[PDB]
Amino acid sequence: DITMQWYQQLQDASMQCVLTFEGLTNSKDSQAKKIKMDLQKAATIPVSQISTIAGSKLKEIFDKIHSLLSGKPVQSGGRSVSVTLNPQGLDFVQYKLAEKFVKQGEEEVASHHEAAFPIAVVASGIWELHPRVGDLILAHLHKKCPYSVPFYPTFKEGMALEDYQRMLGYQVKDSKVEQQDNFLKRMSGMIRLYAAIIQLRWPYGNRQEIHPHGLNHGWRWLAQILNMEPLSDVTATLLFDFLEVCGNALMKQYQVQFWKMLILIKEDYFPRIEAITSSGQMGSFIRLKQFLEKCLQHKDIPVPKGFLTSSFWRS
Amino acid sequence: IIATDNVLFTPRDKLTVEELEQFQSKKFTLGKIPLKPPPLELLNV
Ligand SMILES: [Cl-]
């Protein structure tokens, strides 16, 4: 109840953003469309280039976003863009930026798990400098992936099925819904990105304050899905690829309390999944078990493959 | 900006006795893991 209220706040607060720049997207002029596209363009290219191999280029993208969003001008395709005296453009760019951060976790991190970390540090620093952009990141992240709240959408009477399949996060064309394999991968990448945000912090800038969306939200998420009955394939999947990404940082921060949480899913929550899942869809639960058996006897959770190293920050 | 709570370790005080006794046990209880993060005193158990 406490979480669903907070969920609605960010949701209704994102809806207020959809209306605050009303008329900037609803226009038929040639210039009204030229501004909208040029801002939508100069606010998503930097995030698309985050697939990087050196911190030196990753900082170029960070500043390019910070300049564009703070009021300063930025280079786009052909001509330079600005936002001053574009009160709709400022609130409009925070929306398109926040969604592009999630879209990359949806169509890049799903295919390639390593890309979560360079996207997380950049999303974490902008969230730190602009907490409004971060609340918009949680808004889209939450709706596109309600399992990240976490909350399992419920079977609804009185609403159409397509509207309900939309609730579950399934991608739907006008005719039909996407498959499950393409949907489970999209959901994974979205929480691997989120599991990366709550542990990484943008190094440069000298920030006095706390992490914007701290690693505490990682503890509750695990607590909040393990105190509720698991879904057949989703839970065992999302649970694994969350611990692999944030299990190390959670072990260090919560030393024994995390191990207690790990000797519980092995002893209590694993039997919970055996009854609910048919033999046809055990592929997720088996990889959830292989992942622990190592960690439990090794007394350590491996660092996520793709974590940023010192060599990266010098490159 | 919307209200969001960001505490890494919840203080031992202000915490419910339910959640306190879960953290102090050698094993958790299924379905009652505390939502708030553990406190600073019990990270060495
Ligand atoms: Cl909360």
TrEMBL record, chain B:
Protein name as annotated: Nucleoporin NUP42
Domain of life of the source: Eukaryota
Places the protein is found: Nucleus membrane; Nucleus, Nuclear pore complex
Residues of the full protein shown: 381 to 423 of 423
Entry function: Required for the export of mRNAs containing poly(A) tails from the nucleus into the cytoplasm.
